[PDB]
Structures are given as C-alpha cells and as structure tokens.
Design a binder for these strands. Structure first.
Ligand SMILES: [Mg+2]
Lengths: 69, 138, 207, 15, 69
DNA sequence: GCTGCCCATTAAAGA
DNA sequence: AAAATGTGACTTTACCCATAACTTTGCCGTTACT
DNA sequence: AGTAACGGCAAAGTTATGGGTAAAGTCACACTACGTCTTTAATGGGCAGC
C-alpha cells in the first residue's frame, strides 16, 4: 500500500512490515533545501510533466515510422 | 444438450432457483422469503413448462450465460484487414521487428489510406491471437 | 553461486540524500560517455558481395541532453583509431569536446595516445571500475535503443543468434544480409542526428 | 549426396 | 549402456556402446533408434546392425521428440 | 604411346 | 590502494464506454375462491 | 362483489466482449556465438605394366 503527497514529489509513504515508512525519490535530494511553497508548485509541475510526456508517444511513433519507411 | 451448454456457475444459479421453487411445489411456503413474488412465479412457471415438455423441469431453470455478451467486432472492417495484412507481411518476417515500430508503420499506412487507425492495445491483442507455429516460423 | 558478474543486477542503488554533483551533469558538454559495441547486423562486401561480419559501433554521448554526440562504425576491434575518429567528428560537426569523459577500463583507454590527447585538449578522464556498467549506464542503454529503433528492423540482424541452439541454414543472417557499411553508417547517423535528436526524452521533457 | 552411403542390400546374419 | 570418451562421436562410440551393451546383458536391442547424425548414416554402423538382425530406425531431422526417452 | 591401379581432396549437412 | 551511476523503449494491466443477450424485477389484467 | 394467486409487458440489471487511454511493469544496454568433427562417393594426379 502506498500514499503520495501531491505537494511533494520527493516524498512517498509505503506500508512495510506494519509501518508507514518514508520513501525517497530523486526530486527529493534535487529539491532539498527549498521552501514548502515552491516545492508544491514544482511538484504539480512535474506531475503534468511526466504525464504529458506519456501522451507524445504518437509523434515519436510517427517519426520512427517515417524513418523506417 | 441444453444442460451441457451451461457452466458450473449456471449449475449453481439453477440450483438456487430450484431450492427457491421447491417449497412452493410442496405446499409449505416459507414465512421469510427474500425473493419477490414475480420472480418465484416465473421460475415456477418455467419449471412447470419444462416438466411438461422435456420430461425434466430443472432444464428450464438454466441461464446459459455464455450465450449473452457482445461478440461483435468494434473496429471497422477496413482497419481489421489492414492490420491483418501488416501483421502478416511486416511482423511475421525474418527480422524480429518490435511491436511498436510495426504499429507505427500500420498507423502511417492507415493515415495515408484514410481509415480509422487502431490502438497499440488492439495490435498487441490481435498479435497474441495469431500466436503459434506460423508466428514462430515466420 | 554464480559470481560477481551475475550478482551485479541486485547489487545496490546509490540514492542521493543531499545535493552532490549531479549524476548526469549540469549543462551540455560537461560529462560525455564513450562506449563501443558489436552491432547485431551482418554486412556484405560492397563490390564482391561476400559477407564481412558485424560492424563495431562507437558512441560518444553527453550525459545531460542524451544527445548522441558522435557515432562511428568500423569493422575492426576496439583500437585508438576508433577514438581518434569519434572525437574528430565530435570536434567537427559540433565544435569542441567534453569536459569529463568517462570511459571504461578498455585498452583503448589505458593506452598512451588517448590519455595524451585528453591531456592536450584538457578533458578530465574518468574511469568506471571493472565489470561495473551503471557508471556509463546512460550511454549503454543508448545501444539498446539503437537496436530496437534502427538495427533490429534490418535484414541480416544478429538477433536470432542469441538462441544459438535454434539456428538453421534458412535463417542464418549471413545468407540474408544485404546492407553495406557505408549505407548502414549513413542511416545510423540519420537516426542519431535527426530521428532520435528530435524525439522527446522522458528524463528531459524535451528533445 | 555428401557422405551418403550408396543404396545397397547388406547381408544379414553372422557369416 | 553408458560410454565416455573425449573424442567427438563417430563409429568408435557406437562400437564401444554396442560392445558394452552385449557384454553387460548379452543381446542387442531388436529395434535400434538413432538420430540422423553422420556417425549413424555410415557403412560400419549399418552393417553392424545388419549382422545382428537389428531393425534400424531413423528419427526425422530436427525432431528430437522421437528420442524423448 | 596406351591403359589400369591404389592414394588425397573436394562436396555439404547434421549433431 | 581504493567509494557512491541505472536507464527508458517497448509491453501489459487496469479501468471506463458501448451494446448484445438474456435474467430480474414491479405492475396491472385476469381468474378461482369465498 | 372483494381478495389472493398466476401470468403477460416491459424496463432494469447482469455478465460478457471487443474497443479506448493512462500508468504500472519488463528487461536489455552492459565485447561476443556461429564453430567443429564426422561421413561416403567421385575424381584427379602420379606410377606402373603392356
Ligand atoms: Mg549490440
């Protein structure tokens, strides 16, 4: 079981052995030493980011198709 | 044959119908029945019809849930034909092409042809339905 | 049970706690990885049509933008010539050269020539430990992509030879190969310079 | 063809 | 019969295995099933099987299931 | 000058 | 004599929208019985 | 003539099946498989006898 902070990429929480346990990503150390107000804005920015990149697979596929043709 | 068309859960549901009907067919209805009147009346009527026609009433209580379901294809036929052709002539080849590149080529051909393009899930599902000797040999 | 090479998959991940120097650099032309591989494609002779084998591909790629900085193809094994070449093209179509160049523990890199050239052009030479591949991981996976997007979609590819026990004279790529070194290099450069170059990256959200 | 023994009817039984 | 030798299979391996089979038990098997290897499609093995009234069976090429035992 | 007789070698495919 | 590099391209679930082919119901008409 | 039980009409619900997108999950990049022994038959030289 997992929980996540919409206001923080760097943090997650997983249920291991009977303990809500902190989980560290990468946008944690990379986002260490900043406030809690810009952290949440950068967090929302990276959510849409990682989404919107999943949707652009069509253009990559089209370019690959032209090259392979 | 009607019995043999049914499934184990069809057997269970028809048995539930039978245990609902049987007290009504014994003159001792229960004083606490969750099933309403119309449903038990329908089940009893079907029991009577089956026992009066086929010589065994339980066959009337069968549901045959396999007969229901939308077994109709949703993609247009031109897309189906073009995807079959692409699978035959661009995926079953001595090149071991990945599904993504052949799907991209299929999408480009569909866009030139003006036909509705399929999704990657559609291509994967129709490729895993053509698996066997033919795919492994080509 | 198996050894230190096989246990390397489950070894460990070094998870950053604080802000050390970034793994993949801070700007273009800061950390560039150099690595070679044996391309899985058979090539016939341009004139006489006899099979020549599998060419070797040498990649120099920056770690920041993942852009394939220089690509080289030669039939020979790993030897300086390789290195002079990738670096010539680097300093040719682009302009300069890296700042920190990681390079495994080859011989082409423990030689005197490559080290002297790096000293002359002031490039910090970094060396990954033996049998460890994650230290040039960003480079090495760029090989696999080249397999899926360009190489495995060609005739005579050396893909079905991974299962050596299932190979027949009707499926041997040495009888199906038709490509040549020049055309294969041309199309590999096309893929690395205008196909993969304009494709959006998951780790950058931009081409 | 190659290494292929010619068609023959070999005697059977220990001489 | 079990035989072990460093050399690649040839008519010598068949010779030794058949001699061992005769020594341990006393009789060769009535129908000997062999693979399409060149060491079986030779002149020594065929006359050896003919001498002792042994029906020789040949599994089709690239079909190992015929020797599934 | 003509003809018969044992030795090397080429041929590929299957384990 | 020695710290401190995993990626990301290509698949596979997983959930939602649409519709077929029936069961599951209420509700009213009809009828046997009081 | 009033009331309870039975059955038709119909819509409501239930699985089922072929589609769509979005995101969790796999796995190959890590130098690398093609290589070697065995088999009979035909042929082509030299070498020798007539
Ligand atoms: Mg490779």
């Amino acid at each position: 079981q997992i929980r996540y902070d919409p206001f923080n990429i760097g943090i997650a929480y997983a249920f291991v052995r009977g303990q809500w346990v902190q989980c560290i990503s990468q946008y944690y150390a990379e986002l260490q030493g900043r406030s809690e107000k810009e952290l949440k804005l950068a967090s929302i920015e990276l959510r849409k980011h990682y989404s919107n990149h999943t949707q652009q697979s069509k253009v990559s596929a089209k370019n690959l198709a032209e090259f392979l043709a | 044959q009607r019995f043999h068309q049914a499934s184990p859960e069809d057997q269970a549901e028809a048995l539930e119908r039978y245990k609902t009907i049987e007290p009504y067919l014994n003159g001792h209805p229960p004083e606490n029945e969750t099933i309403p009147a119309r449903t038990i009346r329908h089940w009893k009527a079907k029991y009577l019809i089956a026992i009066q026609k086929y010589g065994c009433g339980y066959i009337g209580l069968l549901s045959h849930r396999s007969v229901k379901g939308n077994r109709q294809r949703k993609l247009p036929e031109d897309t189906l034909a073009i995807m079959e052709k692409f699978i035959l002539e661009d995926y079953e080849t001595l090149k071991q092409k990945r599904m993504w590149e052949v799907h991209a080529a299929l999408v480009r051909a569909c866009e030139e042809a003006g036909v509705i393009a399929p999704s990657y899930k559609a291509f994967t599902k129709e490729v895993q339905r053509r698996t066997g000797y033919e795919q492994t040999k080509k | 049970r198996q050894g230190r090479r096989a246990a390397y998959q489950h070894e460990s991940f070094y998870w950053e706690l604080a802000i050390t120097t970034p793994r993949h650099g801070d700007r273009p032309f800061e950390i560039g990885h150099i690595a070679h591989t044996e391309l899985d494609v058979e090539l016939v002779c341009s004139d006489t049509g006899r099979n020549l084998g599998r060419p070797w591909a040498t990649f120099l790629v920056d770690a920041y933008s993942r852009r394939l900085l220089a690509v080289y193809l030669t039939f020979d094994s790993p030897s300086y010539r390789s290195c002079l070449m990738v670096l010539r093209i680097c300093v040719k179509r682009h302009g300069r050269l890296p700042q920190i160049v990681v390079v495994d523990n080859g011989a082409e890199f423990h030689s005197v020539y490559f080290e002297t050239l790096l000293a002359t052009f002031e490039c910090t030479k970094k060396q990954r430990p033996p049998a460890k591949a994650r230290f040039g991981s960003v480079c090495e996976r760029l090989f696999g992509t080249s397999n899926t997007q360009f190489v495995h979609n060609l005739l005579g590819n050396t893909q079905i030879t991974r299962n050596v026990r299932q190979v027949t004279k009707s499926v041997n790529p040495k009888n199906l190969a038709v490509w040549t070194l020049g055309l294969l290099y041309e199309y590999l450069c096309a893929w690395a310079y205008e196909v993969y170059d304009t494709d959006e990256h998951p780790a950058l959200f931009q081409s | 063809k190659v290494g292929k023994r010619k068609p023959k009817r070999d005697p059977i039984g220990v001489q």
